Design an enzyme around this catalytic site. Structure first.
Site, PDB file in Angstrom:
ATOM      1  N   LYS A  90      -5.206  -9.714  -7.655  1.00  0.00           N
ATOM      2  CA  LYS A  90      -5.797  -9.059  -6.426  1.00  0.00           C
ATOM      3  C   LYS A  90      -6.777  -8.112  -6.965  1.00  0.00           C
ATOM      4  O   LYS A  90      -6.472  -7.161  -7.784  1.00  0.00           O
ATOM      5  CB  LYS A  90      -4.766  -8.323  -5.546  1.00  0.00           C
ATOM      6  CG  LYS A  90      -5.241  -7.714  -4.241  1.00  0.00           C
ATOM      7  CD  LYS A  90      -4.063  -7.054  -3.489  1.00  0.00           C
ATOM      8  CE  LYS A  90      -4.372  -6.842  -1.997  1.00  0.00           C
ATOM      9  NZ  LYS A  90      -5.228  -5.714  -1.768  1.00  0.00           N
ATOM     10  N   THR A 136      -5.301  -0.101  -2.751  1.00  0.00           N
ATOM     11  CA  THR A 136      -5.090   1.367  -2.602  1.00  0.00           C
ATOM     12  C   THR A 136      -3.585   1.558  -2.326  1.00  0.00           C
ATOM     13  O   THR A 136      -3.008   0.738  -1.637  1.00  0.00           O
ATOM     14  CB  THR A 136      -5.970   2.001  -1.546  1.00  0.00           C
ATOM     15  OG1 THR A 136      -7.312   1.828  -1.989  1.00  0.00           O
ATOM     16  CG2 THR A 136      -5.762   3.489  -1.354  1.00  0.00           C
ATOM     17  N   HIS A 174      -3.015  -3.395   7.902  1.00  0.00           N
ATOM     18  CA  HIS A 174      -4.111  -3.608   6.916  1.00  0.00           C
ATOM     19  C   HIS A 174      -4.691  -2.334   6.528  1.00  0.00           C
ATOM     20  O   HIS A 174      -4.861  -1.355   7.227  1.00  0.00           O
ATOM     21  CB  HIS A 174      -5.084  -4.664   7.470  1.00  0.00           C
ATOM     22  CG  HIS A 174      -6.504  -4.471   7.072  1.00  0.00           C
ATOM     23  ND1 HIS A 174      -7.019  -5.017   5.919  1.00  0.00           N
ATOM     24  CD2 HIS A 174      -7.471  -3.792   7.793  1.00  0.00           C
ATOM     25  CE1 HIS A 174      -8.306  -4.639   5.901  1.00  0.00           C
ATOM     26  NE2 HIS A 174      -8.648  -3.934   7.085  1.00  0.00           N
ATOM     27  N   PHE A 175      -5.077  -2.201   5.186  1.00  0.00           N
ATOM     28  CA  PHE A 175      -5.713  -1.023   4.674  1.00  0.00           C
ATOM     29  C   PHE A 175      -7.235  -1.334   4.636  1.00  0.00           C
ATOM     30  O   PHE A 175      -7.621  -2.161   3.806  1.00  0.00           O
ATOM     31  CB  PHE A 175      -5.198  -0.717   3.176  1.00  0.00           C
ATOM     32  CG  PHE A 175      -5.669   0.630   2.738  1.00  0.00           C
ATOM     33  CD1 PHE A 175      -4.909   1.782   3.023  1.00  0.00           C
ATOM     34  CD2 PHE A 175      -6.920   0.801   2.086  1.00  0.00           C
ATOM     35  CE1 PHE A 175      -5.373   3.045   2.652  1.00  0.00           C
ATOM     36  CE2 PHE A 175      -7.359   2.021   1.759  1.00  0.00           C
ATOM     37  CZ  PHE A 175      -6.645   3.174   2.026  1.00  0.00           C
ATOM     38  N   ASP A 176      -7.938  -0.592   5.488  1.00  0.00           N
ATOM     39  CA  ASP A 176      -9.397  -0.877   5.541  1.00  0.00           C
ATOM     40  C   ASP A 176     -10.252  -0.186   4.558  1.00  0.00           C
ATOM     41  O   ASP A 176     -11.171  -0.712   3.969  1.00  0.00           O
ATOM     42  CB  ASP A 176      -9.807  -0.542   7.021  1.00  0.00           C
ATOM     43  CG  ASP A 176     -11.061  -1.453   7.396  1.00  0.00           C
ATOM     44  OD1 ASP A 176     -10.888  -2.609   7.224  1.00  0.00           O
ATOM     45  OD2 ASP A 176     -12.105  -0.817   7.706  1.00  0.00           O
ATOM     46  N   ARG A 226      -8.622  -0.846  -9.278  1.00  0.00           N
ATOM     47  CA  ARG A 226      -9.762  -1.861  -9.382  1.00  0.00           C
ATOM     48  C   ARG A 226      -9.664  -2.620 -10.666  1.00  0.00           C
ATOM     49  O   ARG A 226      -9.471  -1.896 -11.676  1.00  0.00           O
ATOM     50  CB  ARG A 226     -11.108  -1.123  -9.224  1.00  0.00           C
ATOM     51  CG  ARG A 226     -11.415  -0.631  -7.862  1.00  0.00           C
ATOM     52  CD  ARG A 226     -12.570   0.265  -7.643  1.00  0.00           C
ATOM     53  NE  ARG A 226     -12.605   0.485  -6.154  1.00  0.00           N
ATOM     54  CZ  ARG A 226     -13.236  -0.368  -5.373  1.00  0.00           C
ATOM     55  NH1 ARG A 226     -14.204  -1.189  -5.749  1.00  0.00           N
ATOM     56  NH2 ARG A 226     -12.654  -0.598  -4.187  1.00  0.00           N
ATOM     57  N   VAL A 237      -8.817  -5.449  -5.773  1.00  0.00           N
ATOM     58  CA  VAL A 237      -8.837  -4.018  -5.405  1.00  0.00           C
ATOM     59  C   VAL A 237      -7.557  -3.781  -4.556  1.00  0.00           C
ATOM     60  O   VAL A 237      -7.134  -4.671  -3.834  1.00  0.00           O
ATOM     61  CB  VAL A 237     -10.117  -3.696  -4.600  1.00  0.00           C
ATOM     62  CG1 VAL A 237     -10.020  -2.440  -3.788  1.00  0.00           C
ATOM     63  CG2 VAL A 237     -11.333  -3.594  -5.545  1.00  0.00           C
ATOM     64  N   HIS A 268       0.658  -1.279   0.000  1.00  0.00           N
ATOM     65  CA  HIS A 268       0.000   0.000   0.000  1.00  0.00           C
ATOM     66  C   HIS A 268       0.684   1.329   0.000  1.00  0.00           C
ATOM     67  O   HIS A 268       0.093   2.363  -0.025  1.00  0.00           O
ATOM     68  CB  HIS A 268      -0.974   0.041   1.337  1.00  0.00           C
ATOM     69  CG  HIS A 268      -1.920  -1.118   1.234  1.00  0.00           C
ATOM     70  ND1 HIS A 268      -2.998  -1.051   0.395  1.00  0.00           N
ATOM     71  CD2 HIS A 268      -1.903  -2.297   1.894  1.00  0.00           C
ATOM     72  CE1 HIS A 268      -3.588  -2.182   0.511  1.00  0.00           C
ATOM     73  NE2 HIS A 268      -3.036  -3.020   1.415  1.00  0.00           N
TER      74      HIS A 268
END
Length: 124
Positions: free
Chosen positions: A41, A45, A119-121, A85, A43, A12
């Site tokens: 993968k 960010t 983790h990217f939420d 995406r 999606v 990320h």
């Protein structure tokens, strides 16, 4: 094996660019960060800020993760991010993505000591 903190950073962080410079940012980044190695993968960010600014979110506004966990935090400030995406034509091994640039707050899950993103939420 790769730590969750290392994997966060690999998946990320993109402190080397201020934003996505072309529609191909995501195609290139997903592949180079090894996110298409085994499967596409869906999606992802990328955050275009310094590592320390991102790691500092672990001490900003506490908020419950999508999954309910209480170790999530919302950045006080907006951040430059790139949303990737899969496109309709994406097909392994030829993973393809739509690149969308924006400035929004980030929400990450943190763990350990030092307490860092793991983790990217979401972006909000």
């Amino acid at each position: 094996k790769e730590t969750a903190a290392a994997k966060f950073e690999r998946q990320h962080m993109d402190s080397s660019t201020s934003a996505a410079s072309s529609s191909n940012y995501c195609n290139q980044m997903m592949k180079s960060r090894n996110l298409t190695k085994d499967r596409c993968k869906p999606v992802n960010t990328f955050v275009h800020e310094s590592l320390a600014d991102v790691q500092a979110v672990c001490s900003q506004k506490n908020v419950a993760c999508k999954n309910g966990q209480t170790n999530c935090y919302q950045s006080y400030s907006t951040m430059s991010i790139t949303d990737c995406r899969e496109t309709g034509s994406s097909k392994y091994p030829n993973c393809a993505y739509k690149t969308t640039q924006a400035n929004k707050h980030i929400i990450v899950a943190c763990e350990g000591n030092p307490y860092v993103p793991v983790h990217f939420d979401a972006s909000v």
